[PDB]
Amino acid sequence: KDMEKYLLSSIRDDGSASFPLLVYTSDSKTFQQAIIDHIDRTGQTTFTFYVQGGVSGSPMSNSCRGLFMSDTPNTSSLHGVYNAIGTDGRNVTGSVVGSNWTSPKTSPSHKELWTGAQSFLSTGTTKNLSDDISNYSYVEVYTTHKTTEKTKGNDNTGTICHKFYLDGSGTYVCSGTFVSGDRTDTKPPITEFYRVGVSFKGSTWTLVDSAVQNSKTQYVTRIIGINMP
Amino acid sequence: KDMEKYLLSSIRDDGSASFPLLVYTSDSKTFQQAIIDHIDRTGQTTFTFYVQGGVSGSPMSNSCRGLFMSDTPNTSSLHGVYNAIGTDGRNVTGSVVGSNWTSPKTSPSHKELWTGAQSFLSTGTTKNLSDDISNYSYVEVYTTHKTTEKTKGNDNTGTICHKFYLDGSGTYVCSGTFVSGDRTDTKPPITEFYRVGVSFKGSTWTLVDSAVQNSKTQYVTRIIGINMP
Amino acid sequence: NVPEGTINTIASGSSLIRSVNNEYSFNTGTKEESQEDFKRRFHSFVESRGRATNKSVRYGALQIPDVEGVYVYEETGHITVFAHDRNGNLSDTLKEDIIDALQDYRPSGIMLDVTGVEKEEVNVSATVTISNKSRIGDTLQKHIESVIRSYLNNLKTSDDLIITDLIQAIMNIDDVLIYDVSFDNLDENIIVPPQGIIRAGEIKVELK
Amino acid sequence: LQKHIESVIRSYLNNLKTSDDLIITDLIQAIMNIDDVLIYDVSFDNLDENIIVPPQGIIRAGEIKVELK
Amino acid sequence: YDLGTAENESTIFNKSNNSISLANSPVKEIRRVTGQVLIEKERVTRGAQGDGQDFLSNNTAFEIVKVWTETSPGVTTKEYKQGEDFRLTDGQTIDW
Amino acid sequence: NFIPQPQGLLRFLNTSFVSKFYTPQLQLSELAKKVLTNIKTDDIPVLEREFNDNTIIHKANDTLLKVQAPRMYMILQSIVLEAYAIVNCFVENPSSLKYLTEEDVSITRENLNYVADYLGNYDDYNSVVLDLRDLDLCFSAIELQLPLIKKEA
Amino acid sequence: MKTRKLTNILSKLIDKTMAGTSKITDFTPGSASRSLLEAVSLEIEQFYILTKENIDWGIQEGIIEAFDFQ
Amino acid sequence: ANFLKNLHPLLRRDRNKKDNQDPNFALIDALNEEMNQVEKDAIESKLQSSLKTSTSEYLDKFGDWFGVYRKTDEKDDVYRARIIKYLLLKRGTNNAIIDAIKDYL
Secondary structure, three states: OOOOOOOOOEEOOOOOEEOOEEEOHHHOOOHHHHHHHHHHHHOOOEEEEEEOOOOOOOOOOOOEEEEEEOOOOOHHHOEEEEEEEEOOOOEEEEEEEOOEEOOOEEEOEEEEEEEEEEEOOOOOEEEEOOOOHHHOOEEEEEEEEEEEEEEOOEEEEEEEEEEEEOOOOOOEEEEEEEEEOOOOOOOOOEEEEEEEEEEEEOOEEEEEEEEEOOOOOOEEEEEEEEEOO | OOOOOOOOOEEOOOOOEEOOEEEOHHHOOOHHHHHHHHHHHHOOOOEEEEEOOOOOOOOOOOOEEEEEEOOOOOHHHOOEEEEEEEOOOOEEEEEEEOOEEOOOEEOOEEEEEEEEEEEOOOOOEEEEOOOOHHHOOEEEEEEEEEEEEEEOOEEEEEEEOOEEEOOOOOOEEEEEEEEOOOOOOOOOOOEEEEEEEEEEEOOEEEEEEEEOOOOOOOEEEEEEEEEOO | OEOOOOOOOOOOOOOOOOOOOOOOOEOOOOOOOOHHHHHHHHHHHHHOOOOOOHHHHHHHOOOOOOOOOOEEEOOOOOOEEEOOOOOOOOOHHHHHHHHHHHOOOOOOOOOOOOOOOEEEEOOEEEEEEEOOOOOOOHHHHHHHHHHHHHHHHOOOOOOOOOHHHHHHHHOOOOOOOEEEEEOOOOOOOOOOOOOEEEEOOOEEEEEO | OHHHHHHHHHHHHOOOOOOOOOOHHHHHHHHHOOOOOOOOOOOOOOOOOOOOOOOOOOOOOOOOOOOOO | OOOOOOOOOOOOOOOOOOOOOOOOOOOOOOOOOOOOOOOOOOOOOOOOOOOOEEEOOOOOOOOOOOOEEEOOOOOEEEEOOEOOOEEEEOOOEEEO | OOOOEOHHHHHHHOOOOOOOOOOOOOOOOHHHHHHHHHHHHOOOOEOOOOOOOOOOOOOOOOOOHHHHOHHHHHHHHHHHHHHHHHHHHHHOOHHHHHOOOHHHHHHHHHHHHHHHHHHOOOOOOHHHHHHHHHHHHHHHHHHOOHHHHHHHO | OOOOOHHHHHHHHHHHHHHOOOOOOOOOOOOHHHHHHHHHHHHHHHHHHHHHHHHHHHHHHHHHHOOOOO | OOHHHHOOOOOOOOOOOOOOOOHHHHHHHHHHHHHHHHHHHHHHHHHHOOOOOOOOHHHHHHHHHHOOOOOOOOOHHHHHHHHHHHOOOOOOOHHHHHHHHHHHO
16 A cells, blocks of 8 residues: 555555546536545656546546656645546547646547549449548548540649548539640640549448549549548 | 555655655656666566656646556667657657657647537527537537539538637638539539638637538538637 | 521522631420419418518528528517428528528518427337247348338427327237337337427347 | 207118127227218227127117217 | 379369369379360440449459450450550459 | 328328439438428328228338338439329319429439338348339439420420 | 339340440430330339239239128 | 341341451341340249249248248248148147147157
């Protein structure tokens, strides 16, 4: 029992390890106050915690587990950081600086769901994702083009992102333009338009429709599943 | 103190806990050298640290705290990782493989600032954000559209992102194109442009202006605050 | 209509000409549309400008993508209009957006407070008596359970739930097989108000 | 409509085979068969429990009084 | 009853002398033969993915005798060049 | 001046899998909207007999499509309303044929093909499909003939 | 026999036409060949449905003719 | 008869040797193949009209008409055998009752 002021875990009377800070909604205390009370009682400076979901001022709304790090137990001018992980695996970080508490920074996360080269003309084609779309809140769709004319001898665009929120639409619409060519006296640079429409269902995606203003081949090439929790 | 070879925390002379590594700009040592010196002096392999802002080779420019992890105290071929948090709650991670140090990997972060459905025809209307816009260096504006003509039977677009660096413009301008209709039945694919202009003031945002090419309601539907520190 | 570079030829055969091509696609070949559709769309536009009307208010609630099941109700003391989304009953942010967005077609004073539909669940332990010693099987059990669940789902959310109707639905099967059904959990006729909605739940058929 | 309900019930009472209990569920389903929407609910005062008939009993007579709510 | 195995016992296929000698003996049991049949003519109708894969009757294909569009049977429109037009891929694909 | 309607039809009319060839859109015609309101509000005369044992009589209500696939059952109602709307004007009160257009019948057939294809999976309920295929070619003749009728009249 | 729907018969006809040494032909909608294929498929569907109905009627009529029970 | 024999007597009946692609031959082959498959199906329909060879749904219909319904996870042969046997109960005899007990056992 005499080492626990330095160590990440408490010791229960049966000798079992546990967290030294537990915070429950029944305690009627904010996450900030629970930390201050905990340092005042123990003199611990680096320690682990459980916060129950719905605790006010918690790093996140769900229950979370995390680590608080500090070097000096002065609650009248506290300086320190925490890193917390949710029950959904979200990551959040935050800090306290002269006892003032910073807004909790939530990290986004991603998985590559599909890659390849699906032509815009391949309408009615379905392909497998590496995961279910319901494990995401946002999607990036990527498209790779050739312009109608060449500018300084090149017609490639590089591979262009389209980011969407997953609102439950039956089509997600990638659409845009290019300017192409070199301006001569007789020939201005041309303008073109493009579209591709996609849909998602579980672990699958479908190329629904398109429009192309030249005879070259335009492709859908990457789908990334994004969480911004 | 017979445990201090393993503890995340040092034991100060009074018995108070602290970090076993404290790195200050007054030491005139790089973070990499401070880590090497600490491991050489103690044989610890997993330990906490503070790095003052302005220390050369630091995970970040600001003052930060973190955990270093390794399984073997061989400074002539160091293998390990670190996780660090700044005074702003940014997160930075990195690694040492065979005493070669990787580039530090700063996470971005985000917050949802507003959601709903504001019609593009509600110009001069102001709504609250969940936070002050000055906490963010970047913003994503989401808009949801119904196209002038149906594509295969559908006119919904999904919910489309528009990402801006917060350069202090009085109006951030979403503008772009939807290809609408299909080049089918006996009908041209009627291209439409659009614009909406929006602005931000502390914890509020205003729909400033709009330009729409058909008789269907178009909406602003989400605003996300982004940090890329 | 034709894409760029499709002609490639001339019929007059004069050998001076090297090649021919249309620089831009033709898109001016408009189709023929009768004035009926034009008149319909114009009338629809003219009717959508009405203000302070039941049908116009209902129409205006449809602009939000998540507002689908709008139901109109009228009361002088406190008028109310109910709406819900497919994902669930109602959220707080959507409800606030509905309140703020409906003001464009509400009458003066804005004496509205939209509340999300109060879903209720039904649980039934029905004992079903069958006078047939061969058709007796889990197929019939599953069919009756599916029928009851669908009938529960098929209610028009306005005082439609009664034990007699459930008995009549069960007895829609030929009386040669079905003999008797004895409800036990339904001890009264549940009559949800127009705010709430009654739907299916855990539903059992035990054979007798 | 009252007379039609009385005649339907009395006819249901007849053309009934021997040695079967006076099941009420089939009675209510039979009288609700006339119109599912028009007819709302039906209830009874004393014969809510099925009357077991002996081998030599047949339920054919009976006077019907309709008491609309 | 002690036994030896005789695996890749070889003949570069003597189709004139078909009696291919298993000279280790007395042979208790045979296990495998493998060798170089030729597809003299197979339809690989082109699949949709222009400039890439189409699939053979064999994954064991290792030497592509001819690849050609047909003016009629064997009468060639284009005979294609291996590594330039098509290549063999997978041991299982003509691949444009 | 309206012929009384059968009780069956009047009750019927008053209120995942996907096919690759034809798909529905759940769009109602203006003419079909007006009739629906008329039946909803005004008490149309109705018959008392049910001699005619055809159409929805013991076929559309007998099938389990009502409980199993209620969405599919919503397509069938729309086709009946659209089939009953076009029969309404021509037989009597032709003044309502002004609101009908080509696209009104076009979408109806597409909805017919989708529900018809789905019913082909079931081996019991082919009787319903038997009438729908005959009705399918009936709408197409109106589709290719309705623009001429209005100009002639 | 087993009931065959229009879509399956149409797909089988399309696949036989493609495999039957014919690349020029296309089965887009509005074509004459697609309409003829669909019509033939619907005729075969009608034939199968009427065959099943005749099998049911035949079973009933044979059971009537069997015994003396009517 | 079959679709080839009756079709318009000036049309072709066999593959062209001038070219490999024959849309005529493809169409006629497809229609021939479909209508000969339908013919095979229609010849096999004769077996389903008899209890001696009826299978699957038609055997179930026969059982239902005879009152012998299909037991769960019962194959066609045993179900047909029980349906046929069911007529020959010869109930009332002591050895009949013994047979019925042996069946029940």
